Design a protein around this motif. Sequence first.
Motif, short mmCIF file in Angstrom:
data_model
loop_
_atom_site.label_atom_id
_atom_site.label_comp_id
_atom_site.label_asym_id
_atom_site.label_seq_id
_atom_site.Cartn_x
_atom_site.Cartn_y
_atom_site.Cartn_z
N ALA C 44 0.68 -1.03 -0.22
CA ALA C 44 0.29 -0.32 0.22
C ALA C 44 0.96 1.28 0.35
CB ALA C 44 -0.65 -0.05 1.17
N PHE C 45 2.11 0.93 0.72
CA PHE C 45 2.71 2.38 0.75
C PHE C 45 3.78 2.61 -0.97
CE2 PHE C 45 2.48 3.60 4.39
CZ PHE C 45 4.03 4.20 5.01
N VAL C 46 3.98 1.44 -1.70
CA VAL C 46 4.19 1.49 -2.81
C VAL C 46 2.92 2.92 -3.98
CG1 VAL C 46 5.39 -0.66 -3.44
CG2 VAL C 46 3.01 -1.17 -3.94
N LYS C 47 1.61 2.47 -3.64
CA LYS C 47 0.63 3.61 -3.76
C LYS C 47 1.03 4.81 -3.35
CE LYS C 47 -2.97 -0.35 -3.88
NZ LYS C 47 -2.14 -0.72 -2.55
N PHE C 48 1.93 4.61 -2.39
CA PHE C 48 2.71 5.93 -1.76
C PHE C 48 3.05 6.79 -2.91
CE2 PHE C 48 0.39 5.67 2.40
CZ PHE C 48 -0.79 5.82 1.54
N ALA C 49 4.16 5.84 -2.89
CA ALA C 49 5.64 6.20 -3.15
C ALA C 49 5.72 6.92 -5.06
CB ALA C 49 6.29 5.00 -3.30
N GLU C 50 4.76 5.96 -5.56
CA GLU C 50 4.27 6.93 -7.20
C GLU C 50 3.35 8.04 -7.17
OE1 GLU C 50 4.03 2.97 -7.82
OE2 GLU C 50 6.22 3.70 -6.75
N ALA C 51 2.80 8.07 -6.42
CA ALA C 51 1.31 9.20 -5.98
C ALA C 51 2.20 10.24 -5.90
CB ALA C 51 0.04 8.98 -5.23
N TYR C 76 10.21 0.82 3.49
CA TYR C 76 10.02 0.67 1.97
C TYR C 76 10.97 1.79 1.72
CZ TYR C 76 8.27 0.35 -2.45
OH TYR C 76 8.11 1.27 -3.82
N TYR C 77 11.30 1.52 0.51
CA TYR C 77 12.52 2.57 0.04
C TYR C 77 12.42 2.30 -0.65
CZ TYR C 77 17.68 3.19 -1.15
OH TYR C 77 18.73 4.22 -1.85
N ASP C 78 11.98 3.36 -1.74
CA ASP C 78 11.87 3.72 -3.24
C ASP C 78 13.46 4.41 -3.64
OD1 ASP C 78 11.28 3.74 -5.55
OD2 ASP C 78 9.10 5.14 -5.63
N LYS C 79 14.12 3.75 -4.59
CA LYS C 79 15.11 4.55 -4.86
C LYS C 79 14.94 5.83 -6.08
CE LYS C 79 19.16 3.72 -6.85
NZ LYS C 79 19.63 5.24 -7.13
N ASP C 80 14.28 5.65 -6.29
CA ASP C 80 13.66 7.05 -7.44
C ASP C 80 12.76 7.92 -6.43
OD1 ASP C 80 11.84 4.52 -8.04
OD2 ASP C 80 12.15 4.76 -9.67
N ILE C 85 13.30 13.10 -3.04
CA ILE C 85 13.39 14.04 -1.52
C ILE C 85 15.28 14.19 -1.19
CG2 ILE C 85 13.81 12.98 0.78
CD1 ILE C 85 11.50 11.64 0.27
N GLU C 86 16.15 14.05 -1.79
CA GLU C 86 18.06 14.38 -0.96
C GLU C 86 17.39 16.02 -2.40
OE1 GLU C 86 20.92 12.04 -2.20
OE2 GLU C 86 20.81 11.98 -4.13
N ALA C 87 16.95 15.47 -2.91
CA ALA C 87 16.84 16.04 -4.15
C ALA C 87 16.20 18.16 -3.92
CB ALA C 87 16.98 16.45 -5.66
N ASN C 88 15.25 17.16 -3.03
CA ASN C 88 14.82 18.60 -2.10
C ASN C 88 14.87 19.14 -1.03
OD1 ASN C 88 12.63 20.16 -0.30
ND2 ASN C 88 10.84 19.30 -2.54
N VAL C 89 15.88 18.07 -0.41
CA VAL C 89 16.75 18.85 0.57
C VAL C 89 17.79 19.90 0.28
CG1 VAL C 89 18.04 18.02 2.66
CG2 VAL C 89 15.63 17.15 1.60
#
Lengths: 97, 217, 245, 81, 62, 88, 52, 124, 102
Positions: C44-51, C76-80, C85-89
Amino acid sequence: MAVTSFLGKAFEKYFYDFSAYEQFGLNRFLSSKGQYVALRHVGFVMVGVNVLLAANFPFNPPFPTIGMCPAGWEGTWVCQADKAKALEMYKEWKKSN
Amino acid sequence: SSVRDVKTGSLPTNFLTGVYRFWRSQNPAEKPHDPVNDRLLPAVVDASDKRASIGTWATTFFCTIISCNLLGLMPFNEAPTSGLGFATGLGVSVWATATILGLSKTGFKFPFIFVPLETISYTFRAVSLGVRLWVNMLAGHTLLHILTGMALALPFSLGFFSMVPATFGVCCLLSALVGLEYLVAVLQSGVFSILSTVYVGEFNHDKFIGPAAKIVK
Amino acid sequence: PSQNLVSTFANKVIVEENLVNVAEIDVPFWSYWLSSAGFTSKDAFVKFAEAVKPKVAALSTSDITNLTVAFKRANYYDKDLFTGIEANVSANFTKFETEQLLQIVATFDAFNHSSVAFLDDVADSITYCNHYLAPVRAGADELATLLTYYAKNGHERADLLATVARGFSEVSLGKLSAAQRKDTVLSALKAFQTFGFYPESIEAVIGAALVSPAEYSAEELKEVEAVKVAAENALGGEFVLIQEG
Amino acid sequence: SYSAYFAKAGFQFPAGLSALVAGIVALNVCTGRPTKGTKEISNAEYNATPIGYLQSPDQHPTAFPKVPGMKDVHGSPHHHH
Amino acid sequence: MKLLPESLQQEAATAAVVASWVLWHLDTQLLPTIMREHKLHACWAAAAKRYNEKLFKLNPSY
Amino acid sequence: VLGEVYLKDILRTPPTGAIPANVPHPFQTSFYTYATKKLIPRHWYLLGGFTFTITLYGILDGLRDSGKKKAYDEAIHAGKTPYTAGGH
Amino acid sequence: TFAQRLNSSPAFSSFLLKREKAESEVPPSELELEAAQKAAELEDPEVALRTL
Amino acid sequence: EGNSVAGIIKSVNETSGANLLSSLKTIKAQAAPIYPAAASSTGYSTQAKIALFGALSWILYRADGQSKAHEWIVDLNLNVLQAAWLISFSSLIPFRAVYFAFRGMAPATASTLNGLKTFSSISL
Amino acid sequence: EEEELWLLTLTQQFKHIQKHFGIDLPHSVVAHMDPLLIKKIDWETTNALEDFDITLDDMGAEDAKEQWGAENLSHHFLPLIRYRRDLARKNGDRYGPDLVNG
Ligand SMILES: [Zn+2]
């Protein structure tokens, strides 16, 4: 006029340079200006007391008079030190006057 | 959602800076034995986390009482601190704030025949802090009511704008009592919050944590 | 038929497929609060990580902190996603706080993910863009996570290490349980010798171990005493515990 | 030089004054007791009484009284004396 | 005269509402503004000797 | 050169277009940040002291009406009128 | 000068300070007066180049 | 809104040598800060009218209940005593000395700013 | 003219604060010009240290008062040392002050 812009400028030149301490002379009688203010103050109170009393004079005083009566009243409702008594005498006096 | 813009160096910003820095100066922080450097900086920050905000509380009570006391000197207005529940309700609330601070220094447990006599003289601080504010705002206004009734007895009886040296000497006595009331309005808001720093500052003491291990020389 | 209509309503309207269909509007709000209630649910967190991936480049800093500590708790670790996230920081590094960066780094330290541009923009932000007593408000178990993430990745920022060394004291370690204080003291001394940086507040993380050495091994106290002698000649003196008074 | 920027925004209240005025009003109207000089009566008494007899004389003092104690209304003459 | 109020709890709660609004207004509105301009001046007056010496050592212009 | 991507959101010059909005403090933004970070950790002694007074003065308001009720019943159980009949 | 920048402040257009002058409290010193004149010469950046 | 020094640097770099010294007053004024111009009045805000009608609605309501207060002539003659001191305070308080005395209460206005001493930040 | 943008932004921003502070400078212009000074000042108010310079003056910490002021303008040198670090990274070297012994 503009209602906030006219008399703000009128009150400004009444506040600042309108001075009856010099326009009415008055340095002939008064030593400083710090004592012209110290009796314009007491003058404002004596005028304001005498206006508040005279604007409704025939009244029975709530404050204690010290045994004194205003004018030719002396036994009427104006000088009566019992208040339920003077309410009866005022209602009789109001039909006549 | 959009805050207003403030000019720097405004007069209310300068007054409240000096007022806050005054009441903060009444309970100053104590100097440690160590020099204050990056070793001692968490001990100094934790020393400030355990001190009560008496600098903020005393200028809350300064600014809410001097605003209430000076309402009594505006025309058509009475002072709210001339009421018994208002003025003594601020005095009990300072006393309870000091006690809740002193009770938490432990674990909220309350502290031979001596200690009922330390307690009485301490529980009287509750009512004395508020009644001193209430009676000063009441007794000054009450005397002004009595003497205005006496000073109205003369122009009511005698002439309007007549026999004026009798009423001038009492209109200047009435005027000098409203002037003393401006002094009591400012002093009693100062005495209330000087004493709030004294009562709350009694329990404003904790242990400096400090370095438990050192590398000397 | 009252029980039949409720049971039919329950199997077609309140499921987790529609719970993730209302959760598509604001992702990092719903991602963070559900994961704090114990809702891991890896796919269910994969639906988060693409939304959320078309939105990560324009999130506020408290949204980015809410994504990473939710995707840490759900493990859960979504590398892309985590490069967005690190390009927001590392594009808004002046706006992040040490309270927010110490939680983003501890996510990036679990999931062993780093950049050199990210490691500089987190160290530039903790040192220069944030208050210098913000490590003192941190709690030493989060600062030791930041110290090892810079020693795992071999990144020597001697300005950051003087900043994080403020937040180690008797105060900050005393708020830890002695199981967690031991896991921090060994983790902080292992990072302080990896750079060879022995600040004057290393004598509070050493003295947090030498005042109670009965929780430590002799292997770990050999690790501690290796750092104590390494810090003694750096600071120019000898270690001495203080009995209070 | 910035003097005309501060003349643009005029008067403004303190930044939470609507919560002070709504807090002082909500203490003066949510008293939980009748309104200071009145007494709650039954509906059968309120529907049966004239509005001149519901009024008390004490609650309507004279606006500038010529004798101290003058009241504007007189109320019910049906006293229980 | 007027000594006890009609409700003592209503006057004590008016004092707690007024003094907690002044506490909120000071902590939230006044004291952030006080400290934004007190500490611009104070940080600049405390750093001025070490700021200028750090900047002297940095710019290569001499 | 040092080229304005290094000064971004760090150092700005005095504004030329228009004067911006003031930056809110986190306490002016939300009462929840004030309440949980400052009002409850730092000023709960005052809020406890204001709570003690409102509670104590509700005891004293309860003692004052249970003393009014005691003197009221002791006139209607004693054949007297419980007040001075107003005055008018 | 400082007192001349205070006179055009929003504080001195207020009602109670309208007929007041900031130089009446502490006047500008001789160095502050001569450096306001020198700064007036150099607000022309061509005059500042040729002087330099 | 990019910073005005990079606007100065760009506007001076792309000028020629002939029109450099003529362009220096329009690059000076392109990087001057905005001081917004004195707009028209639109006087007495929607909250300055609430503040003056609500103060008149308070003064009339307080003078209404003062006039039926059983000491009504003493109450109305105390507003004359209290407003006499508001008049004597406008005529006795040194308002310029009070303004500069509050400026000394605050350390932000009791001194001048102190950093950045001009010899450290040159670019030669 | 290599680092003249940073040195002249410092000059032009402080000269505008100093000309206008305590006279007519709005708080919006301060927070525009110096956003990270306002950010760090707001951290002290948020974290109950709004009297921290009074605390360091009570305990006589005159050298921790100079560190307090220097660490709050610490970000004025950040556009330089992010530039000099990206010089030395693209020139293969390491930045000097980033290193412990260097
Ligand atoms: Zn009165």
